[PDB]
Design an enzyme around this catalytic site. Structure first.
Site, PDB file in Angstrom:
ATOM      1  N   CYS A   1       0.726  -1.190   0.022  1.00  0.00           N
ATOM      2  CA  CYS A   1       0.177  -0.093   0.164  1.00  0.00           C
ATOM      3  C   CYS A   1       0.682   1.359  -0.045  1.00  0.00           C
ATOM      4  CB  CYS A   1      -1.020  -0.020   1.055  1.00  0.00           C
ATOM      5  SG  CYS A   1      -1.521  -1.736   1.459  1.00  0.00           S
TER       6      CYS A   1
ATOM      7  N   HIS B   1      -3.640   6.815   2.130  1.00  0.00           N
ATOM      8  CA  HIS B   1      -4.079   5.512   1.504  1.00  0.00           C
ATOM      9  C   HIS B   1      -5.728   5.406   2.172  1.00  0.00           C
ATOM     10  CE1 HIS B   1      -4.665   1.632   0.689  1.00  0.00           C
ATOM     11  NE2 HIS B   1      -4.513   0.843   1.669  1.00  0.00           N
TER      12      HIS B   1
ATOM     13  N   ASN C   1     -10.534  -0.026  -1.163  1.00  0.00           N
ATOM     14  CA  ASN C   1      -9.036   0.296  -1.019  1.00  0.00           C
ATOM     15  C   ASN C   1      -8.489  -0.451  -2.138  1.00  0.00           C
ATOM     16  OD1 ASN C   1      -6.434  -0.721  -0.217  1.00  0.00           O
ATOM     17  ND2 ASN C   1      -6.985  -0.994   2.100  1.00  0.00           N
TER      18      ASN C   1
HETATM   19  O1  LIG Z   1     -14.245  -1.646  12.390  1.00  0.00           O
HETATM   20  C1  LIG Z   1     -14.129  -2.811  12.018  1.00  0.00           C
HETATM   21  O2  LIG Z   1     -15.073  -3.667  11.903  1.00  0.00           O
HETATM   22  C2  LIG Z   1     -12.923  -3.104  11.037  1.00  0.00           C
HETATM   23  C3  LIG Z   1     -11.447  -2.770  11.607  1.00  0.00           C
HETATM   24  C4  LIG Z   1     -10.495  -3.184  10.726  1.00  0.00           C
HETATM   25  N1  LIG Z   1     -10.537  -2.438   9.683  1.00  0.00           N
HETATM   26  C5  LIG Z   1      -9.388  -1.953   8.836  1.00  0.00           C
HETATM   27  C6  LIG Z   1      -8.093  -2.084   9.432  1.00  0.00           C
HETATM   28  C7  LIG Z   1      -6.776  -2.032   8.388  1.00  0.00           C
HETATM   29  C8  LIG Z   1      -7.163  -1.635   7.348  1.00  0.00           C
HETATM   30  C9  LIG Z   1      -6.021  -1.245   6.279  1.00  0.00           C
HETATM   31  C10 LIG Z   1      -5.944  -1.966   5.262  1.00  0.00           C
HETATM   32  C11 LIG Z   1      -4.695  -1.958   4.273  1.00  0.00           C
HETATM   33  C12 LIG Z   1      -4.580  -2.569   2.993  1.00  0.00           C
HETATM   34  O3  LIG Z   1      -3.473  -3.436   3.264  1.00  0.00           O
HETATM   35  C13 LIG Z   1      -4.024  -0.656   4.462  1.00  0.00           C
HETATM   36  C14 LIG Z   1      -4.167   0.186   5.690  1.00  0.00           C
HETATM   37  C15 LIG Z   1      -5.259  -0.418   6.434  1.00  0.00           C
HETATM   38 CL1  LIG Z   1      -5.548   0.956   7.935  1.00  0.00          CL
HETATM   39  C16 LIG Z   1      -8.439  -1.734   6.588  1.00  0.00           C
HETATM   40  N2  LIG Z   1      -9.526  -2.020   7.395  1.00  0.00           N
HETATM   41  C17 LIG Z   1     -11.704  -2.955   8.690  1.00  0.00           C
HETATM   42  C18 LIG Z   1     -12.989  -2.428   9.763  1.00  0.00           C
END
Ligand SMILES: O=C(O)C1CCN(c2ccc(-c3cc(CO)ccc3Cl)cn2)CC1
Ligand SMILES: O=C(O)C1CCN(c2ccc(-c3cc(CO)ccc3Cl)cn2)CC1
Ligand code: NA
Ligand code: NA
Lengths: 323, 323
Positions: A111, A248, A278
């Protein structure tokens, strides 16, 4: 020698997959996805590879600049979903656009890939022996995700975004902070490729995209937000000089939280994960391309913008530039 | 600032697979392989990944320099056989050696990968922000090859080689020519990754390493040999100033032929595909490491050496430097 962003462009496959479409193949819903992430829909490739999406971005960039393939000195492509390891995705784009004078390579930094590739491209331009080149982030995360896993399958989308980077008389690159922490690598994984030979021990690990959501969430809100704040502090500018902070596009709640931690109003952190989800390395240049399309960023050197990509590795990169 | 190579190191898995061992799993022989390629044996990984091999190179480089992981500014790794796409192979090495202040990324340019990564690393040191970094070529080609194909399976081996690149007030990098031709990409392929989603159309394709041997042979003998000769011509040195020409270790007959085409005696083109086979991005730094080990290259700035990697993409890169 100095480098500047002269053109921006983006391309997504036409096929749109809404949260409602996902609710039909898995135990999820639009209310749950939208409230937790900000994502409403994402683009999913039906027939196009990562190099196909990146080729469309390259063609769009050259058309805007009024240049042909032969005029390019390099093509640097950031992806974690290449069509193949050999040839590289960048070499495929090179062939597709007839960039016979360019060298091509892919950069792997998940990313943070677009930011790492833009910094790399800038070092080649800084030598004064390379005048123009493409820096593209492109992904087909649809082929990486575990569609049977509702916790991750809803988070990622496909797309490509990029820039034409050129030699300039003006220093546009004001600050940079490229970082990695492989000691936390297991919290974001994809594409495991085990040993396979009549002389190798039988290997079998999960190759689909896997994430420890809480670990990555905290990494962005604590480690990355601190690093962005430190980059601004060490840069010749102040937080109030920034027109926009293009981060990002992983989670809208994360942008609210990082904006508070950095100490900037949320209006300065644009978002488009609502439309694209994403897209890993493609997330920042797609966001930048739309900002230009909507007249938010004219690309006339009148603005100071911060770019911050963060994710797998763990990696995080911050650039402060005049655009 | 200027960059210089201060340390060199190599690491291969302990398991040795001779041409005789191959004759047990395929209808081939020692005589045919050795006469056509120069290869007598190769190292095949039993339990070690590409990042494992690269970790051993990193540990060896730091030990020789008398430094620890925290002193490194970057780790740039060239491979077409990464452990995973996410985290990158370089991020895995970073974790393994405790390089907490470094940024890490992989560069994809097949057999030209080490040269492209060394050129890239040199641009980062040239900025004056960075003082020390690792540039490693590492492969586990054993996991890439089609072991049922006697024409290609006997050609490739596993291993890693790399350098410690440090800041210097004296110029060492004298000339460079980085090139690509994706329009000829189909003659050397590996790692195809097709679309896979409930919204994707996927026909599937062969992901194992495939090569049009005569097309690549002719590319090396014509295109690459000419490019090396042109690099020397345009450089501030002449052919006779070169102590050694360290070329990609794919075929010994190719080395004889481009030495004639370049117009240099074969004694100036060392070879070690006899022991290692073709290790793609790792081939030049393993060869350089052995040259240092055997006292051929003292690493005291007394010599002028040419590095030339060539292969998949198509890619070819030439560097002329003081070592
Ligand atoms: O609150 C909830 O139910 C959930 C809690 C967890 N979440 C997340 C956490 C991290 C990411 C993420 C991913 C990447 C890609 O490699 C990069 C950067 C990030 Cl910060 C995406 N989503 C989803 C919602
Ligand atoms: O003589 C015979 O029967 C055959 C003739 C064909 N051969 C070849 C052909 C090409 C390569 C090669 C491969 C790469 C990929 O790293 C890069 C660069 C090269 Cl020049 C190696 N061997 C095998 C022996
Ligand atoms: Na500041
Ligand atoms: Na010359």
């Amino acid at each position: 020698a100095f480098a500047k962003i002269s053109q921006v462009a983006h391309y997504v496959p036409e096929q749109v997959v809404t949260n409602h479409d996902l609710a039909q193949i898995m135990d999820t819903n639009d209310e749950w996805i939208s409230s937790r992430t900000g994502i409403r829909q994402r683009h999913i490739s039906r027939t196009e590879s990562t190099s196909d999406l990146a080729t469309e971005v390259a063609k769009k960039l050259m058309a805007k600049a009024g240049i042909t393939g032969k005029e390019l000195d390099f093509i640097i492509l950031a992806t974690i979903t290449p069509d193949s390891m050999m040839p590289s995705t960048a070499a495929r784009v090179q062939a597709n656009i007839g960039a016979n004078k360019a060298f091509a390579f892919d950069l792997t930094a998940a990313c943070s890939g677009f930011v790492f590739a833009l910094s790399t491209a800038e070092k080649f331009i800084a030598s004064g022996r390379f005048q123009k080149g493409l820096v593209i982030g492109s992904e087909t995360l649809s082929k990486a995700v575990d569609w049977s896993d509702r916790s991750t399958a809803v988070l990622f989308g496909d797309g490509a975004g990029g820039v034409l980077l050129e030699a300039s008389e003006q220093e546009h690159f004001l600050a940079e902070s490229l970082n990695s922490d492989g000691s936390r690598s297991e919290c974001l994984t994809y594409g495991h490729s085990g040993l396979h030979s009549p002389f190798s021990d039988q290997e079998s690990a999960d190759s689909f995209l896997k994430m420890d959501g809480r670990t990555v969430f905290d990494f962005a809100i604590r480690d990355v937000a601190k690093s962005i704040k430190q980059t601004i502090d060490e840069s010749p500018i102040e937080v109030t000089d920034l027109d926009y902070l293009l981060l990002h596009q992983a989670n809208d709640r994360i942008l609210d939280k990082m904006a508070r931690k950095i100490g900037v109003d949320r209006a300065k952190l644009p978002a488009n994960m609502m439309e694209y989800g994403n897209t890993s390395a493609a997330s920042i240049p797609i966001l930048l391309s739309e900002c230009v399309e909507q007249g938010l960023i004219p690309l006339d050197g009148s603005q100071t913008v911060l770019l911050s990509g963060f994710g797998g590795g763990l990696t995080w990169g911050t650039l402060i530039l005049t655009i």
